[PDB]
Amino acid sequence: KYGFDTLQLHAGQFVDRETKSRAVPIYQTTSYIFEAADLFALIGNPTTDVLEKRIAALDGGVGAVATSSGQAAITYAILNIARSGDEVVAASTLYGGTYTLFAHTLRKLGITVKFVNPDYLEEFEKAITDKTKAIFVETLGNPNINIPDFEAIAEIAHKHGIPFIVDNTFATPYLFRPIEHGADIVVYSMTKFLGGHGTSIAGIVVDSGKFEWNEKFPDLIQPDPSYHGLIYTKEFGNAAYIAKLRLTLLRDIGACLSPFNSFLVLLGVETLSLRMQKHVDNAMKLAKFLNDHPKVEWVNYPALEGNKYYELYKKYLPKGPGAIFTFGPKGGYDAAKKIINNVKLFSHLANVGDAKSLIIHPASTTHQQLTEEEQRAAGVLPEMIRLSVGIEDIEDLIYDIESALN
Amino acid sequence: KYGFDTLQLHAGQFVDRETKSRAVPIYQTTSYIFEIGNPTTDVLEKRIAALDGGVGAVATSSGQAAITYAILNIARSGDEVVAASTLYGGTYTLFAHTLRKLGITVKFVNPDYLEEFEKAITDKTKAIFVETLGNPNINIPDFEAIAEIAHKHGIPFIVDNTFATPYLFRPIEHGADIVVYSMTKFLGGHGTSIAGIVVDSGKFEWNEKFPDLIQPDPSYHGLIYTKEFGNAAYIAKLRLTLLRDIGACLSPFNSFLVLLGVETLSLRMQKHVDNAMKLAKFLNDHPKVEWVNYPALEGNKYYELYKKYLPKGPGAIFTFGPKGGYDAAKKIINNVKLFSHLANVGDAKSLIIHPASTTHQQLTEEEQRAAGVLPEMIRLSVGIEDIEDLIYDIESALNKVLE
Amino acid sequence: KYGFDTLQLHAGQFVDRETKSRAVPIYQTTSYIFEAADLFALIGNPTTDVLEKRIAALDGGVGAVATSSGQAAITYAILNIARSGDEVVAASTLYGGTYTLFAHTLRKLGITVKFVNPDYLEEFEKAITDKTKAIFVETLGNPNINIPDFEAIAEIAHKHGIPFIVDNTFATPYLFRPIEHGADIVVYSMTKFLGGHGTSIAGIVVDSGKFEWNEKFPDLIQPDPSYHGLIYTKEFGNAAYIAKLRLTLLRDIGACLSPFNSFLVLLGVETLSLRMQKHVDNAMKLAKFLNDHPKVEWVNYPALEGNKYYELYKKYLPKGPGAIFTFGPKGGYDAAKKIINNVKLFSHLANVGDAKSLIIHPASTTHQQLTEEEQRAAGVLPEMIRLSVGIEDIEDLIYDIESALN
Amino acid sequence: KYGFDTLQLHAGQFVDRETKSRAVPIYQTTSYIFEIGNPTTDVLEKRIAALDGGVGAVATSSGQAAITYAILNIARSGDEVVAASTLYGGTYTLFAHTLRKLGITVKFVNPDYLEEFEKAITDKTKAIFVETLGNPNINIPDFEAIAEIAHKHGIPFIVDNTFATPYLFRPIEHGADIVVYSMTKFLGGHGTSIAGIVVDSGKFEWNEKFPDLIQPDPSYHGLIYTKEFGNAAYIAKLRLTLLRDIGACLSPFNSFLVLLGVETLSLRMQKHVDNAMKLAKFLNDHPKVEWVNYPALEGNKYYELYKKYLPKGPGAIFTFGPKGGYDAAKKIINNVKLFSHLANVGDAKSLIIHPASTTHQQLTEEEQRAAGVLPEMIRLSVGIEDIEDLIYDIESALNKVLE
Numbered sequence A, C: 001k002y003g004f005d006t007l008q009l010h011a012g013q014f015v016d017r018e019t020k021s022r023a024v025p026i027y028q029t030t031s032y033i034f035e036a037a038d039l040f041a042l043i044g045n046p047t048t049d050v051l052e053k054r055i056a057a058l059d060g061g062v063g064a065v066a067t068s069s070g071q072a073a074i075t076y077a078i079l080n081i082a083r084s085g086d087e088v089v090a091a092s093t094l095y096g097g098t099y100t101l102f103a104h105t106l107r108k109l110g111i112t113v114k115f116v117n118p119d120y121l122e123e124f125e126k127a128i129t130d131k132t133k134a135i136f137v138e139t140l141g142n143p144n145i146n147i148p149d150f151e152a153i154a155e156i157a158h159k160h161g162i163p164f165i166v167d168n169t170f171a172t173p174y175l176f177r178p179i180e181h182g183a184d185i186v187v188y189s190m191t192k193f194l195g196g197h198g199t200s201i202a203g204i205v206v207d208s209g210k211f212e213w214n215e216k217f218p219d220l221i222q223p224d225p226s227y228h229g230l231i232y233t234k235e236f237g238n239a240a241y242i243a244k245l246r247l248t249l250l251r252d253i254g255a256c257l258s259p260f261n262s263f264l265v266l267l268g269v270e271t272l273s274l275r276m277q278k279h280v281d282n283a284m285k286l287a288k289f290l291n292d293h294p295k296v297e298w299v300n301y302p303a304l305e306g307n308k309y310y311e312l313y314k315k316y317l318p319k320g321p322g323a324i325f326t327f328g329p330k331g332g333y334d335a336a337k338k339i340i341n342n343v344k345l346f347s348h349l350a351n352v353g354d355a356k357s358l359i360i361h362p363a364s365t366t367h368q369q370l371t372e373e374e375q376r377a378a379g380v381l382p383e384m385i386r387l388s389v390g391i392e393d394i395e396d397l398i399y400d401i402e403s404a405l406n
Numbered sequence B, D: 001k002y003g004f005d006t007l008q009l010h011a012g013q014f015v016d017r018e019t020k021s022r023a024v025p026i027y028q029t030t031s032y033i034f035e036i037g038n039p040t041t042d043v044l045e046k047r048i049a050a051l052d053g054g055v056g057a058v059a060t061s062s063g064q065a066a067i068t069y070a071i072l073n074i075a076r077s078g079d080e081v082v083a084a085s086t087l088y089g090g091t092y093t094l095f096a097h098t099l100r101k102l103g104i105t106v107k108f109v110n111p112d113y114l115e116e117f118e119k120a121i122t123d124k125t126k127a128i129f130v131e132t133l134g135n136p137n138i139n140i141p142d143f144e145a146i147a148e149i150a151h152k153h154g155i156p157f158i159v160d161n162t163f164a165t166p167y168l169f170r171p172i173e174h175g176a177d178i179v180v181y182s183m184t185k186f187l188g189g190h191g192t193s194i195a196g197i198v199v200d201s202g203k204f205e206w207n208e209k210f211p212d213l214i215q216p217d218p219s220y221h222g223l224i225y226t227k228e229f230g231n232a233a234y235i236a237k238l239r240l241t242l243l244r245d246i247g248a249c250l251s252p253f254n255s256f257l258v259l260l261g262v263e264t265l266s267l268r269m270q271k272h273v274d275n276a277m278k279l280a281k282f283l284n285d286h287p288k289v290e291w292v293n294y295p296a297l298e299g300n301k302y303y304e305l306y307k308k309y310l311p312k313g314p315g316a317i318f319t320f321g322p323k324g325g326y327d328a329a330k331k332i333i334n335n336v337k338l339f340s341h342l343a344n345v346g347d348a349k350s351l352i353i354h355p356a357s358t359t360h361q362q363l364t365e366e367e368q369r370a371a372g373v374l375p376e377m378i379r380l381s382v383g384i385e386d387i388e389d390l391i392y393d394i395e396s397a398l399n400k401v402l403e
Helices: A004-010 A046-059 A070-079 A096-108 A121-127 A150-159 A237-252 A259-269 A272-290 A310-316 A332-342 A372-377 A394-405 B004-010 B039-052 B063-072 B089-101 B114-120 B143-152 B225-245 B252-262 B265-285 B303-309 B325-333 B365-370 B387-398 C004-010 C046-059 C070-079 C096-108 C121-127 C150-159 C237-252 C259-269 C272-290 C310-316 C332-342 C372-377 C394-405 D004-010 D039-052 D063-072 D089-101 D114-120 D143-152 D225-245 D252-262 D265-285 D303-309 D325-333 D365-370 D387-398
Strands: A063-067 A087-091 A112-116 A132-138 A164-167 A185-189 A203-207 A296-300 A324-329 A358-360 A385-388 B056-060 B080-084 B105-109 B125-131 B157-160 B178-182 B196-200 B289-293 B317-322 B351-353 B378-381 C063-067 C087-091 C112-116 C132-138 C164-167 C185-189 C203-207 C296-300 C324-329 C358-360 C385-388 D056-060 D080-084 D105-109 D125-131 D157-160 D178-182 D196-200 D289-293 D317-322 D351-353 D378-381
Touching: A004 A046, A004 A272, A046 A063, A046 A203, A046 A259, A063 A070, A063 A237, A070 A096, A070 A132, A070 A164, A070 A185, A070 A203, A070 A237, A070 B225, A087 A096, A096 A112, A096 B225, A112 A121, A121 A150, A132 A150, A150 A164, A203 A237, A237 B063, A237 B089, A259 A272, A259 B252, A259 C259, A272 A296, A272 A324, A272 A394, A272 C272, A324 A332, A332 A358, A332 A385, A332 A394, B004 B039, B004 B265, B039 B056, B039 B196, B039 B252, B056 B063, B056 B225, B063 B089, B063 B125, B063 B157, B063 B178, B063 B196, B063 B225, B080 B089, B089 B105, B105 B114, B114 B143, B125 B143, B143 B157, B196 B225, B252 B265, B252 D252, B265 B289, B265 B317, B265 B387, B265 D265, B317 B325, B325 B351, B325 B378, B325 B387, C004 C046, C004 C272, C046 C063, C046 C203, C046 C259, C063 C070, C063 C237, C070 C096, C070 C132, C070 C164, C070 C185, C070 C203, C070 C237, C070 D225, C087 C096, C096 C112, C096 D225, C112 C121, C121 C150, C132 C150, C150 C164, C203 C237, C237 D063, C237 D089, C259 C272, C259 D252, C272 C296, C272 C324, C272 C394, C324 C332, C332 C358, C332 C385, C332 C394, D004 D039, D004 D265, D039 D056, D039 D196, D039 D252, D056 D063, D056 D225, D063 D089, D063 D125, D063 D157, D063 D178, D063 D196, D063 D225, D080 D089, D089 D105, D105 D114, D114 D143, D125 D143, D143 D157, D196 D225, D252 D265, D265 D289, D265 D317, D265 D387, D317 D325, D325 D351, D325 D378, D325 D387
Parallel strands: A087 A112, A087 A132, A132 A164, A164 A185, B080 B105, B080 B125, B125 B157, B157 B178, C087 C112, C087 C132, C132 C164, C164 C185, D080 D105, D080 D125, D125 D157, D157 D178
Antiparallel strands: A063 A203, A185 A203, A296 A324, A324 A385, A358 A385, B056 B196, B178 B196, B289 B317, B317 B378, B351 B378, C063 C203, C185 C203, C296 C324, C324 C385, C358 C385, D056 D196, D178 D196, D289 D317, D317 D378, D351 D378
C-alpha cells in the first residue's frame, strides 16, 4: 500500500531486462517479433501500458485503455456497452465536444442520449428506460462548475442494473477518486490537467472491475464471434469491460495513442500531486480576491461560501473543487472583452488544464454565432469570463487581472 | 506543375515566418492563442492530397480510424456499404462486427464477379469499398468497371490503396472518389508510426442519398457543406464533425515521422517492387515451391489487370506455398535469419508470416480455407534489402525442408 | 518583476507568429532559409533559445548557452577564458567526471588545474599565480556535501581580477542563486535536478554580465581574427563572455543540445520550484530519521545540528541544502551492501537528481577498483551509502530503508 | 556476409528481449540500474562501422565534435596535424583558432601537391587530415598516395567523408585509418538532426608517437588500450576519455532520426548523383554559364581521380559561375522557387548559396578569392527532386539574368 506520490512516480513501470533503463523507453514501433498463435488466440504498446497501469493504480481500478483524445475515450466508453437502439442518460452540463458527440454523432449511430439537469435526481430516474445502458456525468460540469451528488446518482444507476460513468478530467485522481463514490467507469482527457503541460492530446478509460455485467450487456456475458465464441466475464474476470474495449473498439476503430504522447503525459503524471495542489491553492486565492473586488459583479466557484455546490465541494472535493471558475465584471459584455484584450500573463485560448493560466470570453469567441437566449440556455452569460488557473505566482495573476479590471 | 519526386519532398510544406526552419517543425501543442487541425499534420495531409490528385485529406490515428471515418462520414444506422470479401482481417471485423453494432450492414461480394456488386446494391447502400491489392489473395479488382457501377447508382467508390501508395497507383485516375491509406505501412515505410488518412478527390456530386452534405448541419450552426466548401464538402464534414466528435487524431510527432518516410516514397517503392518481382520469380521456379500468387507472374488470373492498373509492379506483397504443407511452412518461418517473423506489412525490412501456425491457428483447416488462408500459405512483405541476401535467406530456409 | 514560479513557466517563451502555439514547438531542423550576409557578419536553435533565456532569468544573468552535457558546459566555461599554459584554481571536492576532466583531459591541452581544500580560504589565495584565469567550486561538493563560503571565495577571486565559476547542479536556482553571492559564471548539469525526470543529458553556462573583462583575458578585449577583428566587449557589452562562448566554442567544438532534449528539460523547469521543495522536505525528514536510528552510525547532511556546514546551510541554502546526503550503517562494508541489495523503492544506479529516489554504495561499485587509502582520500568510507532523495511519499522511503536496515 | 543495402537497414540492430520491438526503441534515459554509451546510439555506431568496414565507431553531438574528438584522441598541447587547405569553414576555424589556443599547431598544405604534405610533416606531427571532396573547390585528393606518406612517418590518415558517405566511397579501402562524418548532412539526409561520428578501421599499429595508447592511462585505472582492446584501442580511448570528460554526446532521439535516414542511404545517394550529373551537364552547356566545377565533367582537373576513387559519382555538390559576375549570382539566388537559399548541404532537398553576397560578404573581393571563393561562385547541393523541375527552376532563374 504505497502513497499517491510514490504511485504517480513508479506505478506500472517495470525495468527493461535488455538495457535496465530507469526512464520509460519510447517504443516508437508498429510491430514486435514473435516467439505467435497463442498471442492472437488470447493490441497495445509497452510505453502506453505504463501510463495505462499508472492511471488505473491512482484511481484504484483493475485496468485502463489510453486513446488518441478525451473525445475518443468518451466515444469508446459508451460504444463498449451501447449499440444502435440503446440509450444513455447524461447530465446536460457537459463539455461542448461531449454534447455534440452525444446529441449528433452518436444519435446518427442509433444511440439516443437523454440529457437531464444533474441538480435534480428525480430527473435521472424519470429518464431511465428498458433501453438505457449507462448514466454519464462530469465531476465539475461545463460551463457552470456544478458538482453532482455522485453517491445518490450511483445508487440510482445500480438500482436499475446500469454502470455509472464519471468524466474526471477537471479534478484528476489527486482531487477526486470517483470509484470511492460509486463510479464503475472513469474517463479523462489527459490532454488537460493529467498531462499538465499543454503538449499532448490523449484520453483514457478506467474500469473499476466493480460492476457485475448482467443480461442488459449480452456482448460481455455471451460468446463473441470475432474471437471465436470468447466470453469476456469468463476469460478476463472482473476486467471483462476494459478487455472487450481493447480487443473490439481499439482493434476496430483504432483511436490509439502514439507512444511519444504516452511518454510526455507520463512526465506530467510524475508531478500530478504537486501541480494540482498548486492549481487549487491559486484558484481559491484568486476566486476569494475577485469575490471581494468592487469591479466584479459575481464569482462562480464552489469553494466560496454561498455557492449552491459549497456543501458538495466539502464532501466530495475537500482539497479544492478544481482550478476552473467563471466571474462577471461590472460593465457587461464590453467590459469582459476589454479584460481579455488587456491581460498580459493569462493566455487567450479555448482550452483548459495547462500549467499556464488561461482566459476566455465565450460570448465574444466560442459562442459568438449563437443568440443570447441560446447562450444563456448553454450556461453562457454576456459578462462571463472563464479562468483556468495555472501554477504561476498568485501575486502575478492577481496583479495581471487587477490591472485589466482597472 | 511539379513531378512526383518533387511533391513527395515539397508539397504542403511552407517556410515558417518566425524561424524560417527548412525542416517541418514538430508542433507538439494542445492549443493556439486567438487573434480542428495541426500545422505539422497539415503538411502531410496536403502532401498526400497532391500525390493522389485530391482536393484535400484528413489524417487519423490509424488506417482503421481512416476507414471508420471514411464510412461514418456518409453512412448512419440503417444504411449499407458493399465491400469486397478480400479484406485485411481488421477491416472485416470493423465492417462485420463494430459497424453492425452501429446499425450499418456491410454486404460482402466476390470482387472477381462485377455482377455480384450490382446484385448487392439496394436503396439504402451509401458506398462501394475495395482494396487495390486484396488480403490475402493479392487480387486486383476492375476499378473503372466497379466505379461505373457505383456512379450508375449515385454512390462514391472508396479504395484502400495501402498496399500500392500513389507511386504505384492513383485510384482517382481510374474512378475512385475517396482514397484511404494505412500510412503505418508503405507510406510510412520505417515501421515506427501508426497513422491513417482519408483523401477526397472532390470529383463526386453529392445527392439526396447523402442529406447531411446537401442540407443544413445542426452539428455546425446550420451550415451547408456543398455551399460553403464546394467540391471539398465531404473532407470538410469529416474534419468538422467526426475528427472533432470522435477525436481519432494523429500525433504531430507521428506526422513528422511519416513525412520523413514520404520524402523517399518513389525511391523505396521502386526497390520494393524490383526485389518483390525477382524473388516472386525465384520461388516460382524453385522445386520445393508448389505455387506462388503474385499478379506479375505469367499465368496468374490478375496479370492483364497488373499490366493495366499497376505497370510499375503490383505492390511488394505475395503468397507462396511450399511442397510439404503446414510443416514445411512452419520450418521456413523458424529458419529465416533476415526476414522478420511478425504480423505487420509495409516496412523497409522484409517480413514473413505463416498465418496457419500463427494468426489463424485457432480456426480449423476448413475455417482457414473459407477465409482464403491455405494451410501451407506463407505471406511475404518484400523489403529494400539486397535481393541476393533475401534469395539466399529463403533458399537457406528451403534447404531445411524435405522433398 | 515576476515571481520565480511565473519565470520557470513563461521566461524566454515568445508565441510563434505563424501558428500562435501555446507550447514551445520542437524545431528539429539543421538549417533555416535566408532573407544572409548580415547574419554571418554578426549558432543557435529557437527551442533551445527559450531554455537558455529561462535559466538566465531564474539565475538573474544576462544570457546562457545550452550544451550536450554538464561535462561539455564545464569544458566550455573553462576553455572560453583559459588557453594552453593558463591555470585554474578548483575545490578538490569535485564530481568524478569534473576531476578527470580537470586532472587529465585539460592538463593534456596545457591547462593546469590546481586543486585546493575549499574549507581553507588561505589555500585558494596561496594557489593563485600570474597564469590563473578563474576559481571554480561546486555549491555542494562531492562526495562530502561540503558548502564553500561563496562570498569570501568571491572576494579573493575579484581582488586578483579573475572570475568565480560556480557549478550549481545539486541546488538549482530555486535553492541557491550563486550570482547573489559573488559568482560571475554559473554551470549546470541540467541532466540532474533542473531537468528532473532522468530523461535528457544536457548542460548550460550562465554569464552574470557582472565581470569587467581585463588584460588577463585578451581574447575578450582584443580583435578576434575568426570574425575579422571583432571585439566582444564592444559588440556584446556586458554579455561579451557568453557571446564569445557561442561564436567560438559552440561553433568550433559543436557540443550542441538537440532541440528535443531542450524541449524535455523545459517540461522539468516548468515544475522546478514544486519538485525541489518536495526534494528538500523529503531529504531533511529522511536525514533526521537516519540520524536518530540505532542501526545507523553517522549521517552527513548540512541541515543536521552538529554538521561543520550547518552555519553555511542557514546562510546560503536556507530552503534546504539540496536532497543528496551520505550515511554509514553499523556493520561496515558488508552491512552497506545488504542495504543496496534489500531496498525495493530506491533504485540502484550511479546518477543523482532524478524525481525517483536513488541509492549507491560507492566502495562496492564506482570506487571498487581503488584501495581503501585511495577511497578515503577521495572522500569514500567503506560503510558510506549516498542517497539522492526523490519526491515519493516520505513514509514509503522511510519504510523501504527501515526494512533494509532490519 | 551481407551487401550494402542490407547492412544500411539491419547492421547493429538487435531485437529487444523485453518487448521484441522491430523498430529501434528510443532510450531517452540518463541512467541504467546496476546488476559511456546508449543502446539506440549503439545501433547507429555499429551500423556506420559495418558500412565503412571499421572495427567500431563513437557518435558525437556534431561533425565539429567528431573532428575535435578524432584529433584530441591522439594530439595534445605542443603537437601538430597536417591538414588540406581545402576545408569546410568550420573545420578551418576549429584547426586555426580553437586547436591553436589548446597548443595544437595545424599546418595547412595545397592537397594537389603530394610533396607539400611530406614538407609539412615534422617530429611532432600526429596525423594527416583531408576531406574526400574539399570545400568549396570540390577537389579529390590522392588518398592512397597521401596514406603512404602518413604510413611512411608512422601516423594515421584521417578522412572527412561527409560529402560522399560509405555508399560513394569507403576511405578504409584506399588507406584511411580513421574516418569522420557530419551525419547532419547526407548520412542523415532529411535536414532534421545535427550529429557526428568517428570510425576506427583498427588497421593502424600505434607506436611511441602515441604514448597514451601503448602506455598505462592514469585516467582509466592504469589500463593499456592496445592490451585490453587490441585493434580497437583508438576508438575505446576516445569513448572512455574524451566522450566521458568533454561529453559532446549524441541525443538518443537524434540517433533514431539519423538511423531512419541511413535505412535509405544507397537509394537517396544514387538519386543525388544521378540528379547532380545531369544538372552539372545542363549548366556546363548553358550560354549564361562561364564555368562549372564538378570532377565528373570532362576537362576538370580531378576527372581521372573521380573515375578511380568515386566511379558511382563524385558526390552531389558542385560550384558554377554565371557570365555576369556577383550581380547575376545574386539575381539567380533571388529568383529560384524550388532550390532553398540556406548555408547547409546534404539535405534530400536541393540547396543553393552565393557565398560572396552571404557568408563571405564581409571579406574584400581579394580576401574571398584567397579562401577559394570567386565573386560569381554559386554552390549547389543537388537534392532527390525530379531533375526536370530542378533544370526548369535554374533555367527560369537564368532567364532573369542579362547577356
